[PDB]
Design a protein around this ligand. Structure first.
Ligand SMILES: [Mg+2]
Ligand SMILES: [Mg+2]
Ligand SMILES: [Mg+2]
Ligand SMILES: [Mg+2]
Lengths: 125, 156, 137, 202, 189
RNA sequence: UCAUCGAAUCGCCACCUACAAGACUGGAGCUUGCUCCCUCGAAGGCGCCAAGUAUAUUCAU
RNA sequence: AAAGA
RNA sequence: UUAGGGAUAUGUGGCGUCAAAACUUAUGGGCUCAUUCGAUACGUGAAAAGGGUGUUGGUGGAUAACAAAUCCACCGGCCCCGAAAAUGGAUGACGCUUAAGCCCAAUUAGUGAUUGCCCAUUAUUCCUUUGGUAAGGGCGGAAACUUGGAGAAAGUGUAGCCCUUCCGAUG
RNA sequence: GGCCAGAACCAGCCCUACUGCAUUAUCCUGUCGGCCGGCGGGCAACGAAGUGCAAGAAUUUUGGGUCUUGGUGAAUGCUCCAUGGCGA
């Protein structure tokens, strides 16, 4: 028969698949409070400035279904999955790194090597 | 995370240049004929080569109409084209870079192929988010219609 | 000068009528057009229309949208002040029936509208290999 | 469910490649490595045989079965070059190591796992080749042990040809597209042929 | 005075190079001395000099005459200081962005011209561009305008310093850099 | 007892990337691999909201 | 590992 | 050179992985193959003459023939030997060699004049403390749209009389 | 009340375009040949830089009370009056 295609129409993604390289640091050790993020295709320090100010999300799950946003406006949305939030504050090096500043409490360290969401908002264009 | 040109699609490949070059003897490749520069601040221009100075370094120019100066551009981003003017078989390195290029060798090449790809990749960099839709309905059209043709082949 | 229900502080690209890229909320990826900015620098009141996208007259902010450089050159009415947004839709389809009957028309008007009517229907997807920092809009 | 970036290591220099793989493993990606046999190293084979027979010479004097356990079989020599380029005594670094697999040749479970990948910033041939002596790692490790060079040199021969049976069979299935996709022009709206040409995809 | 005495400088250097003369550029009257190495191990004569220049901590640029007595106090502590001749554009950049006064023994920012006349009082020094002209030229009130100010606590220069241990002429950066300290103070102001 | 982190997918990848034929006839094809990105294809046609401005995608194996 | 592909 | 924090920027040192930074710089000039190359000062000194028929550099002086070019002498190393020990074994590890070595340079690429980039108990700036007895000003009743104070007491010292200002802060 | 997001003035770090602004010589012709010597007038400066003036406008961050107002024609002056939007 006429062959179909896996043409992948699903709920789109408006994020970039960042990932915590680690934390800012020297040889003297580590300074948390400022994370580093590799985004794909962001590799020139003049396109990692396009992200300065973009909200950034470390998605993780706990073990309990704690409260969250719209806990009652959307009881379907409540889950064991949480999210942290920061904003790209600055580039880092000249190869598309970027410094992320998570809101208050820094990002944990079960987050290194694991996925970060660099959303396109707040847009700038 | 790999960008691909197949085969053997490549990890960790910067999207701002390539290490294209494979070493060749200078004299055979080029002789004050014509050349184009991949990586320059002026990007992917072609300028006929005025002379060779030392080894890697060349003096690269173009008459006018391109905002290209007479300048020292290195072979590390300057790669020959087989649209020469004064290299190789033709008797001498010529002068009067406009008149020698008034033989349309550039005008022919600028309207021939491999220059319709230079601005192709430069069109896909100036395509606003509306022509990117146009390009996607254009591929999607040629795509399924390709599948329709495959179905026709199956019938045949 | 300005201290009143005016004094827009938008971007030059974000226009009174221009195709947009909704980046968050229910309708993310959808391509509603901007219809207006609410007074006192209120959020934009973009709509798709719904017939193409699903986005109704909606309040979204100016920073949660990408303004594509292509326009529709809207000429509808100014019949959507900061009310609605007081407090299966009961009594807003009046503002939907009218503006939709103005949008689909306004796109038949502008050239390439055969596309820009199907251009709206599309969602914006971040493909795994793309580079929005590269792109023009 | 998972996503593995199955890398390849023909003509990849042993060290410009373990430095790149280590930092990617350490960026949380799960690399599988194949054809560690064809890994190259600078210098002649004699020099590289002595740089390794001097390491096969180090062992805990009082109890060798606690000493540094030397590995033949380049598959884990590449794992050994990576573990050394890596924070081993953290759980962060032991997870990064345990995300490699580093096979030998192309095993049957990773011939049909999708297209594979190379690292251009480590391929020994970013430029002209002068004359300089390189060493295939599978040929240096044959000479310090690794009884199984014959084995994988035939498993990979029964594959580089069994795959070549499938590039020419199903060859008449390929041009059933590059022609159907070619004549997928001039029957369809010029509306779209023009922008395929514009953006070169014609 | 700036626009005139520079134009008049050009012509005297026009009539010279044309009709067969050399117009010796007169002299820099004023230097601008920045301490570029910290309070670590310092010879006590090196240390007392920098206490009289008010270079008490790293990056404390001070404007300083170049008398015979003075410029030898620079000769002796060059490994520590990095001086030169300040452009007009860099003299007010110091005074306006980083200028502080000694109001009643305090480091009071120069926020208005009213802060100036109350501190100097000396019948001549009224506004801020007036402190500049007293500093840009060797002036008649220079021991007054400078001594009435705090040493310019400055920031480390953006882009970095090439070294700090070698002279400016041997690839490092200290000692005298004639008129090239503007490219060094710009990154610090 | 699962509520999860993850977020292109392959009978057009995936012997080979490079052959064959030019110091002047082009070869190219052992190919920027496809296809994917909002209704199976471009021309329409269609329902969407009140999930009431962002909030892990309230999707999806 | 499969085998199909 | 050091009070508690945040940010901006540097110092020394660096930017292949460990390890933040050139995701291995579009790097540029040469050098280098080293059967223990070489590679951060001071660690202690690494290697001393010596030569060659060796790889690259320079000067004196022939032929126009070596067995259209080919010589007679040396200066200069990188590099070869000279040189060696005893637990297994160290540039710090891997590793690197058409460098990730060495010596020079660079800093967005001969397009047009700046900060390539990363790290501090340093610097700058911002708050907060605390001391100086550091300066001030109030040291009992009035108004800027919401409260706080130029109304909280004549005071070393506090839960300071109230503000705000400077400066210093290790031991 | 705590959690956010957005906005607005303040200063701050700033995005920086065009960069003008003067100088300096670069360079403008003449007939010569595959070892090159037979030279003069600055009147041109977009690739002359050791060098002067720029905001509106880009960014997060931080703090928010003694206000704002209207422009005139000269060679800059009269002046008047009293935060909002979610989720939980
Ligand atoms: Mg780059
Ligand atoms: Mg330094
Ligand atoms: Mg910093
Ligand atoms: Mg080099």
């Amino acid at each position: 028969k006429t062959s179909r295609v896996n043409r992948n129409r699903k709920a789109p993604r408006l994020y970039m698949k960042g990932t915590l390289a680690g934390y800012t640091r020297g040889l003297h050790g580590q300074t948390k409070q400022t994370a580093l993020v590799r985004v794909e295709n962001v590799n020139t320090r003049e396109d990692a400035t396009w992200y300065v100010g973009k909200r950034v999300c470390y998605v993780y799950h706990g073990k309990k279904v704690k409260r969250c946003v719209r806990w009652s406006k959307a009881p379907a949305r409540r889950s064991t999955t949480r999210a942290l939030w920061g904003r790209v504050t600055r580039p880092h090096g000249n190869a598309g790194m970027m410094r992320v500043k998570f809101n208050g409490a820094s990002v944990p360290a079960s987050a290194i090597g694991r996925r970060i969401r660099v959303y396109l908002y707040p847009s700038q264009i | 995370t790999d960008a691909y040109a197949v085969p053997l699609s490549p990890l960790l490949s910067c999207a701002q240049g390539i290490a294209l070059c494979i070493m060749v003897k200078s004299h055979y490749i080029c002789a004050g004929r014509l050349v184009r520069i991949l990586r320059g601040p002026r990007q992917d221009r072609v300028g006929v080569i005025v002379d060779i100075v030392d080894a890697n370094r060349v003096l690269v120019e173009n008459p006018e109409d391109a905002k290209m100066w007479r300048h020292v551009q290195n072979l590390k981003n300057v790669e020959p084209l087989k649209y020469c003017v004064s290299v190789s078989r033709n008797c001498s390195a010529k002068a009067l870079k406009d008149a020698l290029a008034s033989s349309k060798a550039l005008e022919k090449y600028a309207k021939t192929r491999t220059a319709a790809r230079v601005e192709a990749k430069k069109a896909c960099a100036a395509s606003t988010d509306f022509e990117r839709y146009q390009l996607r309905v254009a591929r999607r059209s040629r795509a399924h219609w390709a599948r329709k043709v495959f179905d026709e082949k199956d019938a045949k | 000068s300005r201290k009143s229900p005016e004094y827009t502080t938008l971007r030059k690209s974000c226009a009174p009528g221009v195709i947009a890229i909704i980046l968050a909320g229910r309708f993310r990826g959808r391509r509603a057009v901007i219809l207006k900015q609410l007074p006192h620098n209120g959020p934009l009141v973009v709509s798709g229309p719904m017939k193409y996208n699903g986005v109704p007259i909606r309040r979204i902010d100016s920073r949660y949208v990408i303004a594509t450089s292509t326009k529709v050159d809207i000429s509808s009415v100014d019949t959507a002040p900061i009310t609605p947004e007081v407090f299966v839709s009961d009594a807003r389809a009046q503002l939907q029936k009218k503006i939709d009957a103005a949008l689909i028309a306004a796109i038949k008007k502008d050239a390439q509208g055969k596309e820009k009517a199907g251009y709206l229907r599309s969602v914006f997807t971040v493909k795994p290999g793309d580079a929005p920092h590269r792109w023009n809009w | 469910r998972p996503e593995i970036i199955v890398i390849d290591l023909k003509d990849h220099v042993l060290g410009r490649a373990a430095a790149v793989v280590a930092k990617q493993l350490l960026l949380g990606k799960k690399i599988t490595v194949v054809r560690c046999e064809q890994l190259n190293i600078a210098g002649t084979e004699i020099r590289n045989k002595i740089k390794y027979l001097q390491y096969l010479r180090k062992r805990k004097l009082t109890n060798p079965t606690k000493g540094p356990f030397h590995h033949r079989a380049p598959s884990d020599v590449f794992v050994r070059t990576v573990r050394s380029m890596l924070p081993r005594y953290t759980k962060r670094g032991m997870k990064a190591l345990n995300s490699l697999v580093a096979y030998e040749g192309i095993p049957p479970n990773v011939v049909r796992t999708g297209g594979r990948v190379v690292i251009p910033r480590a391929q020994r041939h970013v430029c002209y080749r002068s004359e300089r002596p390189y060493t295939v790692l599978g040929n240096m490790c044959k000479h310090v042990g690794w009884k199984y060079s014959d084995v994988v040199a035939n498993l990979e021969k029964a594959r580089v040809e069994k795959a070549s049976r499938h590039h020419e069979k199903q060859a008449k299935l390929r041009e059933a597209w590059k022609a159907a996709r070619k004549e997928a022009l001039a029957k369809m709206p010029k509306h779209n042929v023009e922008v395929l040409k514009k953006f070169g995809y014609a | 005075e700036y626009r005139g005495a520079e134009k008049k400088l050009v012509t005297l250097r026009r009539q010279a190079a044309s009709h067969g003369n050399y117009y010796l550029e007169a002299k820099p009257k004023v230097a601008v001395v920045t301490r570029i190495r910290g309070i670590a191990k310092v010879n006590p004569k090196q240390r007392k000099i920098l206490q009289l220049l008010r270079l008490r901590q790293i990056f404390n640029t001070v404007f300083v005459k170049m008398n015979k007595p003075m410029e030898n106090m620079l000769r002796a502590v060059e490994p520590y200081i990095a001086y030169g001749y300040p452009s007009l554009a860099t003299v007010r950049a110091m005074v306006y962005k980083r200028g502080y006064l000694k109001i009643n023994g305090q480091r009071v920012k120069i926020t208005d011209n009213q802060m100036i006349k109350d501190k100097y009082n000396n019948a001549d020094i009224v506004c801020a561009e007036d402190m500049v002209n007293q500093i840009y030229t060797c002036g008649k009130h220079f021991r007054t305008v400078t001594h009435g100010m705090w040493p310019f606590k400055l920031a480390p220069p953006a882009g970095g310093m090439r070294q700090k241990r070698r002279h400016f002429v041997e690839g490092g950066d200290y000692g005298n850099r004639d008129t090239l300290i503007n490219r060094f103070l710009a990154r610090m102001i």
